[PDB]
Amino acid sequence: AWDYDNNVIRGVNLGGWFVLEPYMTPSLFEPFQNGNDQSGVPVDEYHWTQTLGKEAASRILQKHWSTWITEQDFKQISNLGLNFVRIPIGYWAFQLLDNDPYVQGQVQYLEKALGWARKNNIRVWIDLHGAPGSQNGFDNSGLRDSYNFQNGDNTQVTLNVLNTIFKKYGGNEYSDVVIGIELLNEPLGPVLNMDKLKQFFLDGYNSLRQTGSVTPVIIHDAFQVFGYWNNFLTVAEGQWNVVVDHHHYQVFSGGELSRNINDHISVACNWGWDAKKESHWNVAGEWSAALTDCAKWLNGVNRGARYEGAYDNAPYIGSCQPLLDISQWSDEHKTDTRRYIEAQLDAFEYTGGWVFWSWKTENAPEWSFQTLTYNGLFPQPVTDRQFPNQCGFH
């Protein structure tokens, strides 16, 4: 359904749909705010569903699930020149642990989305974005500040959920739409046992193939250096149809944020040069236009921004207020952003392609493909260049 050697992935993530992220849909979290006090806002989906109870959580999510992404967005994605979508989903859509507060029902919408993808000639990756116990402690895993994916039976339950995803979506029914099943989004390499993580990856790889599936297995890089996975899941060991997913951003640390625009572009070009050297097919599964960490709650509910020196002990760079609204952006920030997007697009098209995070946000412009495209900051057509050849690839 896809030629990783010849075609280039040009997609967007359908984030904030099946896994709630506070910075993407702040209106679902804001009702819990007491005036200016943010101490009572649930910090993740786990706490959001627990605080609401099953009845209200199901009513609010059914409304979110049915309106956040619909068939019209798939038509729009296709009309903009995109050929792929990445769909994050948490383990709770398939199985609940005893005492889990999550509600189900996401599957019905996942299946509707696969038919919309088919109708619009869009290919997809199904991404297991959150595992039981949390694989990274991020709010996008469903459970913030916990790192227990490798404790107790959490790894085995993840494998059972993947077996379900393998039997339903890795067979012949969706062979023309599904071009990858991503085993686990962002396992936080530095706090996990890497040997157990590789064993988990190998177990998922073997389990999928054992079902008769030929679907590409996508492994996230677990924040390891470029080339680290060169010797794992290789054709020399009879392991094939494997893709490495790299996520790239330059706003999650004081050092990265302080770079001038030329240095940000140099780093983006370098991502293109180093990925070219890897031996596995690779795709930049997540990246954005963000040059700051100013979007409200991007670092998590009740956490400020490093950009204005209000978090993770970073120095003050500038005020975030003026960057919250794209209509207030200075002419220089608009040019810097377009330059940054074009450098990234060239670097990722140098290898397997790219998937922007994300299609839409309620009001965070740096993270919304729709908003940037409508304001002329994201090239349209996507091959358009106002700043051609900033990297000099050969």
Side-chain angles (χ1 to χ4, degrees):
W2 194 256
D3 182 339
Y4 279 97
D5 280 311
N6 297 302
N7 316 310
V8 52
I9 294 289
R10 285 177 177 161
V12 283
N13 278 279
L14 297 192
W17 200 9
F18 301 139
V19 179
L20 296 181
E21 288 193 49
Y23 82 99
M24 301 188 67
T25 57
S27 72
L28 300 174
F29 288 82
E30 281 164 347
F32 296 98
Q33 277 201 224
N34 285 314
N36 293 314
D37 199 351
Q38 295 185 20
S39 51
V41 194
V43 302
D44 51 32
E45 189 165 329
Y46 188 97
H47 289 88
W48 182 95
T49 58
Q50 191 170 68
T51 296
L52 291 170
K54 304 279 182 169
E55 288 183 356
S58 298
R59 158 179 54 77
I60 295 158
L61 290 172
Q62 287 277 344
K63 181 160 188 218
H64 174 63
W65 300 327
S66 72
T67 54
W68 184 245
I69 300 302
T70 61
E71 190 181 355
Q72 301 303 109
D73 292 278
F74 278 75
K75 290 184 202 49
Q76 192 187 331
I77 284 166
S78 178
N79 281 359
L80 289 170
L82 309 166
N83 59 28
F84 173 89
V85 289
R86 175 166 181 262
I87 308 181
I89 191 159
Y91 77 86
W92 59 87
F94 297 100
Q95 187 75 22
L96 290 171
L97 293 177
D98 310 328
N99 298 339
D100 265 353
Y102 296 119
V103 293
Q104 299 182 305
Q106 299 87 349
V107 169
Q108 121 160 61
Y109 295 94
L110 170 59
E111 296 184 355
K112 284 181 197 88
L114 291 176
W116 302 327
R118 181 177 276 146
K119 157 110 223 69
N120 292 285
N121 194 2
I122 290 169
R123 304 295 199 264
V124 166
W125 283 351
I126 288 173
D127 151 39
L128 185 61
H129 222 67
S134 187
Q135 70 276 20
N136 47 39
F138 298 158
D139 64 23
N140 75 357
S141 61
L143 190 63
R144 212 182 78 180
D145 308 314
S146 157
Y147 308 88
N148 287 306
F149 163 61
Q150 296 187 319
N151 294 317
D153 292 321
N154 291 325
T155 294
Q156 289 294 328
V157 170
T158 308
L159 281 165
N160 290 336
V161 168
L162 285 164
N163 252 72
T164 292
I165 281 152
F166 298 158
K167 289 188 211 178
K168 295 191 74 164
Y169 308 116
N172 59 93
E173 304 89 348
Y174 291 107
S175 67
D176 57 324
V177 175
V178 178
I179 63 170
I181 294 161
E182 184 164 21
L183 306 188
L184 186 56
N185 184 61
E186 305 190 343
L188 190 60
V191 314
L192 304 176
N193 173 323
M194 290 301 298
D195 287 327
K196 285 167 132 174
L197 181 64
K198 283 167 156 172
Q199 182 64 45
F200 162 79
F201 281 165
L202 191 53
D203 289 335
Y205 174 89
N206 288 330
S207 283
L208 178 60
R209 292 279 170 267
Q210 283 179 210
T211 69
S213 175
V214 301
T215 307
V217 175
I218 317 296
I219 55 158
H220 176 259
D221 74 14
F223 305 100
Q224 301 310 289
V225 293
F226 269 118
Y228 179 86
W229 298 101
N230 281 170
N231 62 345
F232 183 72
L233 288 177
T234 61
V235 161
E237 299 168 83
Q239 296 147 343
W240 55 282
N241 259 13
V242 177
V243 181
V244 178
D245 172 19
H246 290 303
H247 293 355
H248 292 305
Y249 294 112
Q250 295 188 45
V251 300
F252 296 117
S253 75
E256 286 167 288
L257 281 168
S258 319
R259 291 174 189 153
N260 55 40
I261 185 60
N262 288 324
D263 288 356
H264 275 302
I265 291 166
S266 292
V267 170
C269 295
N270 182 249
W271 292 331
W273 294 114
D274 294 341
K276 195 64 148 163
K277 300 172 168 82
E278 294 188 315
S279 47
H280 288 283
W281 289 324
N282 57 92
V283 174
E286 287 190 26
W287 63 282
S288 68
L291 288 158
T292 75
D293 64 337
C294 288
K296 184 181 164 169
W297 299 333
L298 175 64
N299 293 313
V301 171
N302 206 16
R303 304 162 163 170
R306 297 175 193 80
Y307 197 70
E308 67 188 5
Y311 184 62
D312 196 23
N313 287 314
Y316 169 94
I317 294 169
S319 293
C320 282
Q321 201 278 352
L323 303 167
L324 302 174
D325 182 19
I326 193 145
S327 75
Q328 303 181 9
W329 285 12
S330 67
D331 286 311
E332 160 156 26
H333 193 75
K334 282 167 164 181
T335 301
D336 287 358
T337 298
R338 174 81 185 221
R339 280 182 56 193
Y340 188 46
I341 291 171
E342 291 191 8
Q344 288 180 95
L345 286 174
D346 290 344
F348 303 147
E349 281 201 18
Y350 196 49
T351 57
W354 46 267
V355 196
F356 190 87
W357 184 277
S358 191
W359 171 237
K360 65 187 278 184
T361 59
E362 275 179 8
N363 56 26
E366 306 155 294
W367 301 89
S368 172
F369 185 100
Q370 274 192 318
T371 301
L372 296 161
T373 294
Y374 299 167
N375 284 264
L377 301 162
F378 203 109
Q380 184 49 50
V382 301
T383 50
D384 189 50
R385 295 289 179 274
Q386 285 180 12
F387 305 93
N389 200 13
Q390 291 173 288
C391 301
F393 294 120
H394 14 86

